[PDB]
Design a protein around this nucleic acid. Sequence first.
DNA 1: CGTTTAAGCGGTTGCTAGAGCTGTCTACGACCAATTGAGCGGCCTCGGCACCGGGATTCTCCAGGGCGGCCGCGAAAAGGG
Length: 49
Amino acid sequence: VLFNFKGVKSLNAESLLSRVEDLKYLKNLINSNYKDDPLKFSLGNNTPK
DNA sequence: CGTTTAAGCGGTTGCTAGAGCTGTCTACGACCAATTGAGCGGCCTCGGCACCGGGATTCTCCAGGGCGGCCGCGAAAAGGG
């Protein structure tokens, strides 16, 4: 998935929208429950690989 | 201490250097006036060093393309009642 916007070729069109939604979800989740202290964020019961 | 030798003193004999005195004069330096150009201060400018803007040149990083390994998953061959 590559495209040209304003003369810049091979721009990641798929990764631009994916990083925009992931950063907005990460910023909203941190500010909702850890607004006083961002260092106290915990993954909870979610177990990654 | 023994021995030789050269310093010290007195003497010759003539000429010349030098101090002292007297005399003349002449070039040379003090002195004065007019003049001006070489010394001291400032003013202006270039040679060279340095500061700043612009352009050419080479090094570093992020992402895409392709390949290997896992995850149970699922179709299939063989055995049992």
